[PDB]
Each structure stands twice: as C-alpha cells, then as structure tokens.
C-alpha cells in the first residue's frame, strides 16, 4: 500500500481537487445579501460574494474586535464555521466564548481540540508501528476531558505511554498551536470522502454513517495543515485559539478482544478563558480520569 | 580629507597590461564656440593639434562640435563606463594639449584616495604566517601538562 507520506499527498490532492471543483461552479462574482441580526451593530447588511465570502469576511467589514472574539457563526439559526463560504442570502450572528449560552461555541472548540489530538497521534509513532484513527467521540464538556479513540499496532498491545511520552504529545500539540493553522472546511459528497479515506476502514464506516443521516449524503471534511479528518460539526477558525492544551491520559477500552482501542484524552482552554496555574492543575487531574460517553 | 571622502584599492580594468595593453580612453567630445573669446585656445587646438592627436590614437573617436557656448568643454568616456567632463575655458593651446594627453593616459577609475600604493592577488609564495608556522611539534601531539595512557 501507500507509504504514510504518500498517503497524505494523495489525500491532500483529492481534497484540493474537490475544493477547486466547487469553486468553478461559482458563476463569476454573484452577490448575496447577508443581514446582521446581532444585538450590536443592528441592521448592517453585507453584500458579499457567493461561495467565496465567509463569515470572517463579514466580521472584517465591522471591526477587528469581531474578528478576534468571533469563534463561530450562526447562519440562519445554524452554527457555521467562520471560514466556511456563505452560499445564499441569509441572516448572520456571531458567537463568542463569553455569550450567555455559549453551548454551540463550546462544542465547536471541544471538537477541534480532539481533531488536533488526532493529528499529533498519527504523526508521533515510529513508522514501524501502525496507527489507525477511529473516531472522536462526542463527550459533553462537563465530562472534564475530550477524548479520541485510536487503534494502535498489535506490537504495541502491552505498551502504555509514560509521563514523558504524554508530555511529548503535549509538546507536539503546542507546536500545532504555534503554527497558527486555519481550520479549513469542505462539504463533499460521500463518494468523494470515501475515496479520500479508502485506505482506512474505520473512516469508511464512519463516513457511511454520517452520509446516511443526511438525505443528500454530503459529509463534512476538515483540514489543518496536511491532516484531513471527518467531523461532527462546525470547528473553530484557527488553532491559535487554544492557549492551555495538554494530553492527559491514555486508557485502554474494554472489551479488548476484538481490537484494543486506546482512548487518548486531553483538556484545553482558549486564550479568552485561560485559567490560573492552580486551577488548571485541578482540571488536569480530573481530565486524567476515564470518560464514558453516554 | 580622507575620512570625509571615499576610497578604493589600487586596481586595473580587465587586468590591463597583463596580456596586452588596451587604451581605456574611448571617446572625446569637444564643444568649441565659433566666436567666443573663451574658446580661442580651443579653436587653435582644433586647427593643428586635434588632427595630429587623432592619428596617434586610432582607438579614440573624437567628436568636435562647433556651436555657441560660453564655456567650452571636453567630455572623456572610458571603456569601464566612466564619464569625465573637463572645462577648457580660456585655456591656451598648450594647456589643452596637456589636458587631452592626460585624459588619454588615465584608466577611467575614480580619482580618489588609493588605500595602498600597490596591489597583488598572490601576496605569499611560501605560505602566509599563522601561529603554528614557527612552532615545533611534539611526540604524539601531547599538550602541556597532559597525562598520556592513563
């Protein structure tokens, strides 16, 4: 089969090819009218470019404050990535971490932190050992840690990561944060996604489930740098939003007979809600406990 | 003063004189008024001197232009691209002859401070001095106060 480096090059080309195709469908520069329905700056209309202009571009028309504080967009009542192109005339609201009900923003930040963990885990092990990405379980924020289910090589069936190893994963995550990479999104049909993730069995099964849920069988793809994954919902704009990030624990899920799925866990806080050293330590301890998604 | 002006190292144009000597003066442009008194000495230089000077320097193209001017000038251009304008206002024929001959002999490099009165690309034949040039070697290259085979 393909080498690990070649596999990324194949997937990125397919991802880029599909991105270029959707851009061509756009006829010249058609204009959509996006009305602002937020509490502040009421009545502002944005005459934007269909399939090119994103919610971030609307924030840029207002002020830098919107761009810095806006983590997610609410497009016609639906959560919308800041960098996802707007496709129709619609109403738009901007969501922050400090809203009275930031539930959707929390989920978006919560899902993104798991996707950043998947990226480091896939690229951490030696080429000898095989890392198979399974899924990012949807666990409530109150659970205290985000988790990502991975399947490791048979050779590493008695290996449990050491504290220095857990710290090594954390240093890789912080390097991803330092790179300040945008979360690129692509809504593609199941067929396109199935081709990208053909080599991975878990993704194919996961991709099939998501397509079945939606009548039009379009699956949401996200990419950070050279890592592509399938997501449950809208993500945050960039990885630089994360400030405190640590991979806390790796648990072995039961039953172990069919396959040994290892639940990697972490906890993180954004720049906007950074915690004091003392409080952060208490969160790290609870994050190290196993979470059982309900 | 030296600190108040630029400087350069002694050099030549395309290693002139190494294989063959090539005169660097390439063009001379005179501007001599027909009637101006200041150009009297320049007119006499064009009648008897310029023709004999051109015979000796066939590699220099001389352009004599007679036009109204209050200050007659000679403009010298060199192969390296240098351009020099020298006034001949009220100069005698002999003075102009001297100036024109000087321009013929110059390389065209900037007439500025020359740091050294000599230049060489091979200053050393026996090896440039270094701190070990005159130091003796020691058995097994042992350093001062160094225990061997401990």
């Amino acid at each position: 089969q393909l080498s690990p480096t070649e596999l990324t090059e194949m997937r990125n080309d397919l991802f880029n090819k599909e991105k270029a195709r959707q851009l061509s469908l756009t006829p010249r520069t058609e204009k959509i009218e996006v009305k602002h329905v937020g509490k502040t700056d009421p009545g502002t209309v944005f005459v934007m470019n269909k399939n090119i202009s994103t919610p971030y571009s609307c924030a840029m028309h207002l002020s830098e404050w919107y761009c810095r504080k806006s983590i997610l967009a609410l497009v016609d009542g639906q959560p919308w990535d800041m960098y996802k192109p707007l496709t129709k005339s619609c109403e738009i609201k901007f969501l922050t971490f400090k809203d009275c009900d930031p539930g959707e923003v929390n989920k978006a930040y919560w899902r993104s932190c798991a996707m950043m963990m998947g990226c480091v885990i896939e690229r951490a092990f030696k080429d000898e050992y095989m890392v198979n990405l399974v899924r990012a379980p949807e666990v409530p924020v109150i659970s205290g840690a985000f988790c990502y289910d991975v399947v490791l090589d048979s050779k590493l069936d008695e290996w449990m990561p050491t504290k220095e190893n857990l710290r090594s994963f954390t240093k890789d995550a912080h390097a991803l944060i330092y790179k300040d990479l945008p979360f690129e999104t692509l809504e593609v049909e199941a067929k396109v996604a199935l081709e990208i993730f053909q080599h991975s069995k878990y993704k194919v099964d996961f991709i099939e489930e998501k397509a079945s849920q939606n009548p039009e069988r379009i699956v949401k793809l996200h990419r950070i740098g050279d890592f592509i994954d399938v997501s449950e919902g809208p993500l945050i704009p960039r990885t630089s939003i994360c400030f405190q990030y640590e991979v806390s624990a790796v648990h072995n899920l039961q039953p172990t007979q069919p396959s040994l799925i290892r639940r990697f866990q972490g906890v993180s806080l954004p720049v906007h809600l950074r915690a004091h050293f003392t409080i952060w330590d208490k969160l790290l301890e609870r994050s190290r406990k196993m979470v059982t998604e309900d | 003063t030296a600190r108040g002006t630029p400087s350069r190292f002694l050099a030549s144009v395309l290693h002139n004189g190494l294989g063959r000597y090539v005169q660097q003066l390439q063009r001379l442009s005179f501007s001599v008024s027909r009637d101006g008194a200041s150009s009297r000495g320049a007119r006499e230089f064009v009648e008897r001197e310029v023709i004999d000077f051109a015979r000796r320097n066939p590699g220099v193209v001389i352009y004599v232009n007679s036009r109204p001017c209050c200050v007659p000038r000679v403009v010298a251009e060199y192969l390296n691209g240098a351009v020099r304008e020298e006034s001949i206002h009220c100069k005698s024929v002999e003075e102009i002859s001297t100036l024109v001959q000087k321009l013929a002999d110059q390389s065209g490099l900037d007439v500025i401070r020359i740091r050294k009165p000599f230049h060489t690309d091979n200053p050393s034949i026996q090896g440039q001095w270094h701190p070990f040039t005159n130091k003796p070697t020691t058995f097994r290259g042992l350093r001062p106060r160094e225990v061997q085979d401990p």
């Binding site: 971490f97 400090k98 809203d99 009275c100 009900d101 930031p102 539930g103 923003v105 929390n106 930040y109 919560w110 924020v141 109150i142 659970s143 205290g144 906890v267 806080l269 954004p270 809600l273 915690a275 409080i279 208490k282 969160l283 609870r286 406990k289 | -």
Partner: protein, 154 residues
C-alpha cells in the same frame, strides 16, 4: 508620613471637608443617585452608610434627630430618612450603597464615581456581571465540583 491616616485632606480644611461631604450626602438622600469625583464619593460613602443606621434608631431618638438635622441641610429630607430610607433597609445590616467608577470627567479628566442608595426607583446602572456559568471554564469546574461531591458522599 501618613501611616494609619484614614481620612483625606480636601476642601479648605477640616470644617470645609465636613461641609463638602455633607452637601454630597444631602444630594444623595434627595436624588438617591449622584456622580462626583471618585475620591470624594469614596470619602462620603462611609457617612452615607452610617446615616442609615441613625435613621434606624427612629425619629423619637433625640440623638438621631440631631445627627440628621446636622447632616441634612434640606429639612424635608429628614422625614424621608426616617420614614422612607431607613424602613427600606430594615432587613439589612449594611451595604446600603453601591459605588462604581464611571469614565473620567470631560473638562479636567477627574476620576469619577457614581453612588446610589440600593433599592431606588431609578433606571438601573449597567452593573458589572460575572461570566455565565455555561462558559467553557465554568462548565469544567462544575464537573470538578460534581465529582468531588459524589466522592465525599461515598
């Protein structure tokens, strides 16, 4: 050296300081919300709190009536103190006033404060509100709290 000196030096001297503070307090009782330089409001706030305590003694306490007579330069406010302001705080032991800093004054850029008697009828000040319990940080701490309580009962 001013170690342990709890009172400020304002006005034209000790008497003028009291008169300056008294005029501010009189305005506060009438209007129930006033704006003035931050330092002067901070100084007067202590007197505004204690005035309520004297009002709670009642209008039949001759000492309280003399205190109110001095501090309230407009005598129609003395009935208000004993019959309106003091009954309103009958069920409180303190904290009758709230003081908040407002933007610097335009003319002289003086630091400014707004002070009001709690429970007034005026439009509410845009009070500083703490972050919602639903924020990411507060939810992670709620989980930590829930967990600790569960481990203690066991």
């Amino acid at each position: 050296i001013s170690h342990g000196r709890v009172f400020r030096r304002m006005g034209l001297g000790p008497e003028s300081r009291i008169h300056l503070l008294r005029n501010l307090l009189t305005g506060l009782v009438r209007h129930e919300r006033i704006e003035a330089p931050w330092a002067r409001v901070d100084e007067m706030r202590g007197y505004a709190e204690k005035l309520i305590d004297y009002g709670k003694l009642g209008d039949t306490n001759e000492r309280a009536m003399r205190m109110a007579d001095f501090w309230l330069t407009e005598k129609d406010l003395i009935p208000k103190l004993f019959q309106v302001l003091a009954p309103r705080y009958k069920d409180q032991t303190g904290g009758y006033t709230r003081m908040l800093q407002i933007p610097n004054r335009s003319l002289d850029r003086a630091k400014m404060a707004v002070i009001e008697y709690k429970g007034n009828c005026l439009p509410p000040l845009p009070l500083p509100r703490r972050d919602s319990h639903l924020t990411l940080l507060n939810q992670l701490l709620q989980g930590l709290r829930q967990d600790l309580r569960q481990s203690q009962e066991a």
